[PDB]
């Protein structure tokens, strides 16, 4: 199974928060405070190892995750995109 | 369906009228607005923001710190994965 991933394009960053999140929570850390961290400091130490947690912050960039974290808020917010 | 109601200036600005009305500037004098918000969310500047509209002046009421805080915090909640 060490030649299974053959699709490397990024996968949802929902999905990705999502199971960060529940890693963070696992490992008894506040996740909403380090993930704050992470997209303060584009540093992915502010994510565990646990679960592949950091593993899976690097496969996305935090410019990307900043795009969709601005994107998604102005929509929510009232402008048609 | 919920109105945005006009307050006095001794409130608080709130991120969600400041950052929907720096949108909506950036648009009408011709930049690309993500693409400044972005600039200014990553670097701190308000320089990114124009004047034009008091866009700048709104986005200079908060700090970058708190903008993200917000559209983290907003984004988990939107989405089921805080609760």
Do not use: C, M
């Not at 929902?14 to 540093?43: A, F």
């Amino acid at each position: 199974v060490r030649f299974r991933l053959d699709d490397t394009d990024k996968q949802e960053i929902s999905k990705t928060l999502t199971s960060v999140y529940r890693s963070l929570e696992e490992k008894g850390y506040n996740p909403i405070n380090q993930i704050i961290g992470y997209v303060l400091s584009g540093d992915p130490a502010y994510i565990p190892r646990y679960n592949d947690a950091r593993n899976q912050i690097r496969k996305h960039e935090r410019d990307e995750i900043i795009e969709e974290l601005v994107r998604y808020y102005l929509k929510g917010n009232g402008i048609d995109l």
